[PDB]
């Protein structure tokens, strides 16, 4: 029903998902003219991020990205409610243009981006219910650049061959999800925005960490080449590349920083 | 019917103008991964650009930009067909974020952008007929940076406070339009794209000059602050700001450069 390329791509999302042409759209370019330091922003705390190795967590190719289900005990503290892991997923580019982050910083794309999606567990019973309601969701964005091999991201990437096609699922043993975050999480950008995919609901509080993490060139190539958007038995298989939205207009509004 | 902000803004253009969701859309980010030097790209020649000082040309606020009508006397030589001028216009941002070029270079916006629109007069009678047809249009793009005052651009900008509202018109004495082009016009980016506004027809051969021109801070602020999208009698005026399209995806394709 929607894609990132061709007729059903992002310029046409608004047809069946009005909100994709509505208010508070994400992602955005983070640049000096729209930033303002807010001394009252607090470091987040990641409570229940260290998942038991004796437990397993479902990895799914949903046709648009790869997601890992996360438990609702996993949560935070630092916003104006409690916000609870639902899943994480990634966005990336392609081997010819390996620059597929969603947010940009001073016009620069990063190689990829990790999103850790939570929901307002104080106001709503689950993520789906929260998704189209006030204050529903909160997403952590980690920018990814090419560099040294990252064993923590390999805890995900080493399973990708078991979820090659849409609808395929496989389990991942628990590991410490905090290992996927950067240094100095205390420094971040924060703004009110949207889901970056249909239905584009304007109900997410974004936190984009200032500092990127690194993965190796080999890990990045593996991610860009592992997956397909189509199901087994689809007559036209389509490789899963360039699964990021273009940056949106951001006018008469501010991104707040926890760093001066 | 269309705008750059709100429900009729660019994520919605495809709902009224199907080509805005189609192939070959402009503008784009000009960055190394999608560039290829093409030594066969020769300098264009700008013929008839020295408009008679004894003639006047119509400047109109069309509710989307300010446009100057140009005569068919003006020709680009050097392409497979001769293209003849029809009009020029500009795109810009706003005083709080004065970075409103359409094309970007290595992720960076410039302050504004000038487009000189031409049509394939060897094949088509006029620009309207050419606009939806094979090899119909060629646009020259000049990137504009804030810095030094530009006397040549002021031959247009000195009239802005007299075309403040939609439908208003002024006359501009003829001058040498080539004075609006940057240094080393032999150096450019070339690609096949589209109109950057509705109807978004994928019929444009783009030439984006490598080097920007400069206009002063005062000139840029005049451009950003003088004009409204609404009629003079309108009780609720809308400022003409941020009249640029976001960059489009550009995958499995190349921009050719005449410089290395
Ligand atoms: C390709 C990745 O898709 C995203 C996604 F981009 C974002 S983002 N970038 O964080 O805005 C997502 F949040 C999600 N999942 C959300 C889960 C919580 C609520 C249920 C509705 C889906 C949104 C998902 S998704 O669940 O993977 C697909 C949702 C289609 O509606
Ligand atoms: C805001 C400026 O609008 C552009 C414009 F952005 C471009 S661009 N960026 O060069 O693609 C245009 F080419 C034009 N005008 C063209 C004139 C020649 C063909 C007739 C159809 C309109 C396109 C015009 S426009 O004529 O000013 C308005 C066109 C509405 O269809
Ligand atoms: Zn995401
Ligand atoms: Zn234009």
Numbering used by the authors:
A (entry chain B), B (entry chain A): 4 to 263
Which text from the study accompanies this structure?
The role of carbonic anhydrase isozyme IX (CAIX) in tumor cell survival, proliferation, migration, pH regulation, and cell-signaling pathways made this enzyme a promising therapeutic target in oncology. , Tumor cells primarily express two membrane-associated carbonic anhydrases, CAIX and CAXII. These isozymes belong to a family of zinc metalloenzymes that catalyze the reversible hydration of CO2 to form HCO3 – and H+. Although the active site is characterized by conserved amino acids between 12 isozymes, the amino acids further away from the zinc ion provide some variability. Crystal structures of CAIX and CAXII with five compounds by using soaking or cocrystallization were determined to confirm the binding mode of the ligands and reveal insights that govern enhanced affinity.
Four ligands in complexes with CAXII are of similar structures, contain a cyclooctylamine group at the 3-position and (3-hydroxypropyl)­sulfonyl tail at the 4-position, but vary in substituents at the 5-position: compound 9 has a (4-hydroxybutyl)­amino moiety, compound 10 - piperidinyl, compound 13 - methoxy, and compound 14 - ethoxy. The introduction of methoxy (compound 13) and ethoxy (compound 14) groups at the 5-position of fluorinated benzenesulfonamide 5c resulted in the most strongly binding compounds for CAIX, with the K d,obs reaching 4.5 pM at pH 7.0. The elongation of the 5-substituent from methoxy to ethoxy decreased binding to CAVB by 12.8-fold and to CAXIII by 6.8-fold, whereas other anhydrases showed up to 2-fold change in affinity. Interestingly, cancer-related CAXII also interacts strongly with 13 and 14, exhibiting 0.05 nM and 0.11 nM binding affinities, respectively. Complexes of CAXII-13 and CAXII-14 each have four subunits in both duplicate structures, and the ligands adopt nearly identical conformations across all eight subunits. First, the meta cyclooctylamino group is positioned in a hydrophobic region of the active site, making the main contacts with A129-S130 (main chain), V119, S133, and side chains of L197 and L139. The meta-ethoxy group in compound 14 is oriented similarly within the hydrophilic region of the active site, but unlike compound 13, there is no space for a water molecule between the ligand and protein side chains. The hydroxyl tail is oriented against the backbone of P200–P201, forming a hydrogen bond with the main chain oxygen of P200 in most subunits. Interestingly, despite the bulkiness of synthesized di-meta-substituted compounds 10, 13, and 14, especially the first one compound 10, which possesses large piperidinyl and cyclooctylamino groups, ligands acquire quite similar binding poses in the soaked and cocrystallized complexes with CAXII.
